[PDB]
Design an enzyme around this catalytic site. Structure first.
Site, PDB file in Angstrom:
ATOM      1  N   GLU A 298       0.801  -1.235   0.000  1.00 38.51           N
ATOM      2  CA  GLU A 298       0.000   0.000   0.000  1.00 38.51           C
ATOM      3  C   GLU A 298       0.832   1.283   0.000  1.00 38.51           C
ATOM      4  OE1 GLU A 298      -3.666  -2.118   2.531  1.00 38.51           O
ATOM      5  OE2 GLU A 298      -3.433   0.054   2.441  1.00 38.51           O
TER       6      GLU A 298
ATOM      7  N   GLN B 153       9.349 -13.788  13.892  1.00 38.42           N
ATOM      8  CA  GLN B 153       9.074 -15.174  14.254  1.00 38.42           C
ATOM      9  C   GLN B 153       7.766 -15.698  13.654  1.00 38.42           C
ATOM     10  OE1 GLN B 153       9.744 -15.740  18.477  1.00 38.42           O
ATOM     11  NE2 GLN B 153      11.600 -14.483  18.426  1.00 38.42           N
TER      12      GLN B 153
ATOM     13  N   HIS C  24       2.247  -5.233   8.099  1.00 36.44           N
ATOM     14  CA  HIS C  24       1.489  -4.651   6.975  1.00 36.44           C
ATOM     15  C   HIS C  24       1.284  -3.188   7.326  1.00 36.44           C
ATOM     16  CE1 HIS C  24      -2.188  -4.083   4.310  1.00 36.44           C
ATOM     17  NE2 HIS C  24      -1.235  -4.526   3.501  1.00 36.44           N
TER      18      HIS C  24
ATOM     19  N   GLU D   7      -2.580   2.555   3.893  1.00 38.53           N
ATOM     20  CA  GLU D   7      -2.199   3.309   2.697  1.00 38.53           C
ATOM     21  C   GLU D   7      -1.428   4.600   3.031  1.00 38.53           C
ATOM     22  OE1 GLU D   7      -5.500   4.474   0.304  1.00 38.53           O
ATOM     23  OE2 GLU D   7      -4.536   3.734  -1.542  1.00 38.53           O
TER      24      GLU D   7
ATOM     25  N   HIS E 215       6.654 -14.814  18.351  1.00 42.56           N
ATOM     26  CA  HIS E 215       5.624 -15.571  17.601  1.00 42.56           C
ATOM     27  C   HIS E 215       4.238 -14.958  17.740  1.00 42.56           C
ATOM     28  CE1 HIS E 215       8.699 -18.826  18.114  1.00 42.56           C
ATOM     29  NE2 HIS E 215       8.670 -18.446  19.385  1.00 42.56           N
TER      30      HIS E 215
ATOM     31  N   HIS F 229       1.650  -3.143  12.865  1.00 36.32           N
ATOM     32  CA  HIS F 229       0.922  -2.639  11.700  1.00 36.32           C
ATOM     33  C   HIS F 229       1.190  -1.147  11.559  1.00 36.32           C
ATOM     34  CE1 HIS F 229      -2.226  -1.768   8.849  1.00 36.32           C
ATOM     35  NE2 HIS F 229      -2.419  -3.080   8.735  1.00 36.32           N
TER      36      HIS F 229
ATOM     37  N   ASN G 142      18.825 -16.209  17.626  1.00 41.16           N
ATOM     38  CA  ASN G 142      18.256 -16.127  16.291  1.00 41.16           C
ATOM     39  C   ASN G 142      19.284 -15.776  15.241  1.00 41.16           C
ATOM     40  OD1 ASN G 142      15.041 -16.338  15.814  1.00 41.16           O
ATOM     41  ND2 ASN G 142      15.456 -15.694  17.926  1.00 41.16           N
TER      42      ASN G 142
END
Ligand code: ZN
Ligand code: ZN
Ligand code: ZN
Lengths: 205, 205, 205
Positions: C54, C67, C73, C76, C109, C114, C194
């Site tokens: 977006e 994880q 995400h 816009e 996890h 966002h 990790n």
């Protein structure tokens, strides 16, 4: 393949591959990595991730189910110096595990059990629930969105939806599962259905 | 394939395959199984799992979106004796569903709607939210991390972030969406964008 | 492929492909789409979805980890009229991002960040946690199931498990990470492990 060995790391000299009972069904869109044992008639659904790559076994008992989006993983159980980190290891019937899931356990969609943790037989871990650094007894119910962190949940108790239990004083006073409780028969139904689904999905593979 | 029929079980004599409108986009890393109908211009994102394998349809209406990691599944609606379990079936416009998602509905990332459930048109189900054994009205907003379990949410109401609504008395007193409310226009924006994303992703397939 | 360009949309005239450091490991069962930059020694686990479709970049800094089941995400950042929506863009060191994840950050996890959002260096975002429309400082800890929405979290603070912080007044009074705090060393351990897992998984590819 979606069933894979774990990698060599400073705390993992020998890679392990999952040990999976021939009657279990592992969905092609699930991921199972490393030192994992999966018992008979277990159903592992799409998007589940069972990852044992930091030492010590993740065990999933017979007739249990690991539903869509569930994650199983564990904290390091062996340090770089080969020293076992005992705080991160649970003991069940004389054996050490990173995560132990008993028999007839339902891990419902999007839940997560993170080691060190043990979940006793005939327990329902509800949708989106979370278990970490905890021992959950047999015949328990974690309602959706509940969590147990750092506690022992006595046999036959339930955690109401949304409640996050972080102290043993709280855990000791959880309500008991009784016949009239709304989720008292939920797990037995979910296990019955999932054992039959596992057999049906196996017949399509 | 990631679009698949459900298996034969004692409560499912005939396997069903998903019915998917040609204008819908199903990501290759999503999973859609069984008796599912997906309407026009729907976008199904990576890691979503829509699984209808315990009887009765899961319906996703036109111009809705099922975002990353969302799970749709339902409790058994037909027992082993072919007897429909009416408590687990929702009724919408004269038809029975296990899960009914209306038109212009956004199921945002990591949310879950578990049958029996119905979600009315133009409703935003926020990130990580949870709906189970509930009817959510039209023009509702479930803010992130909210949950509705066992209730009917009246049209035009919102549930504040993190609130877990489990009693009808609570649901009846939820606040109303008004023009000045922070999420009053969120769904219309998300639907507009996702209908265009579906068309763009279709052009790459 | 599971690493893909984003599609052409009215707000995205040119598709972008992810820029991934050669020392990063992206699991084959993860999804990375669009305008994403992934730094050195990053580990992206199964079922993670990083989707930048977006407008504006999602950036994941060096030695961070994403994880299993984590979603990134963003809202816009460019409207249909080519107009940048400044409310949905975060600024870090003179550059604009939809989501900025700093160096040495663990996204544990099933968490989700966002956009618009920024997460500062050496911060642990715990299991199932949620960050949206927020700036999280450096050296912070979001315990499991915590959330920050619409706030700035000062450096060196933690959010207790299950707490949903939605007002700046609350965020300003969060407790400080101290040496005796249970999660004070968690992130440094998780990052160390990790980075080594990423190298081990790379050796199996
Ligand atoms: Zn872990
Ligand atoms: Zn289910
Ligand atoms: Zn989004």
């Amino acid at each position: 393949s979606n069933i894979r060995e774990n990698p060599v790391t400073p705390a993992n000299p020998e890679p392990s591959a999952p040990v999976i009972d021939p009657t279990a069904y592992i969905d092609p869109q699930a991921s199972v990595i490393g030192e994992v044992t999966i018992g008979a008639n277990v159903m592992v659904s799409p998007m589940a991730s069972i990852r044992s790559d930091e030492g010590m076994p993740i065990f999933v008992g017979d007739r249990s189910n690991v539903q869509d989006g569930v994650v199983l993983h564990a904290l390091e159980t062996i340090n770089e110096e080969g020293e076992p980190i005992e705080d991160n290891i649970v003991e069940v019937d004389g054996k050490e595990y990173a995560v132990y899931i008993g028999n007839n356990v339902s891990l419902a969609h999007q839940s997560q059990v993170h080691g060190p943790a043990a979940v006793g037989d005939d327990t329902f871990i509800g949708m989106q629930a979370f278990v970490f650094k905890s021992k959950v007894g047999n015949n328990c119910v974690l309602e959706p969105r509940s969590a147990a962190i750092g506690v022992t949940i006595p046999d036959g108790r339930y955690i109401p939806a949304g409640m996050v239990v972080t102290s043993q004083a709280e855990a000791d006073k959880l309500p008991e599962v009784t016949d009239d409780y709304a989720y008292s028969h939920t797990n037995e139904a979910v296990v019955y259905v999932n054992v039959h689904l596992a057999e049906g999905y196996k017949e399509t593979s």
